[PDB]
Nucleic acid binder design. Structure first.
Length: 153
DNA sequence: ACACAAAATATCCAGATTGGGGACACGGTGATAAACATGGA
């Protein structure tokens, strides 16, 4: 189906509420700049359109497939191997649009952001339950997850 | 027992010299613990 949402910045009580709006706008724009997103739109009829973009208000329209694609991009994770200084691997999220803008030497700035994300915001195992299962998937292979999307939808 | 008078001018230091030589710490350590919050069937 089609689901439409509208939001205003004059009623949000927390700054993080306002920050999330810009974050999701950037995520949608990053989706709009990926060929595989257009391939998904052509095949599964993915709907994700920003209607109103002004100083105060915001509007969005999306379907189930668009939400699934957004979740796949945002919650993409991979596996990294670490050696003590007897081997151990650590699951690390991809980072979303951060990889698309980080051109620094070795993406060391990305490393700091990834460490904080797993370490504090995601200290609860909940990131790991969601993050580890998601990890290692291939977008080009059509891999997707929708068990959690149904509850959110 | 009466009265009168009770000091005046010159001068009050000159030279040479006021420290020198050596040294201003050595080692060992610079806290240790206990006091949780969210998920799926």
């Amino acid at each position: 189906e089609i689901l439409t949402l509208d939001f205003n910045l004059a009623e949000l009580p927390s700054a993080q509420h306002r920050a999330g709006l810009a974050g999701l706008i950037l995520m949608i724009r990053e989706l709009k700049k990926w060929p595989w997103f257009k391939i998904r739109q052509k095949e599964k009829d993915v709907l994700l359109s920003i209607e109103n973009l002004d100083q105060y208000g915001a509007s969005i329209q999306l379907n189930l497939e668009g939400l699934i694609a957004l979740f796949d991009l945002a919650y993409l994770s991979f596996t990294e191997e670490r050696k003590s200084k007897y081997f151990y691997d650590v699951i690390t999220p991809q980072g979303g649009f951060l990889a698309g803008w980080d051109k620094s030497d070795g993406q060391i700035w990305l490393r700091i952001w990834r460490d904080m994300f797993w370490s504090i915001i995601k200290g609860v195992p909940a990131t790991r339950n969601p993050f580890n299962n998601r990890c290692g998937l291939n977008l080009n292979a059509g891999d997707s997850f929708s068990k959690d999307v149904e509850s959110v939808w």
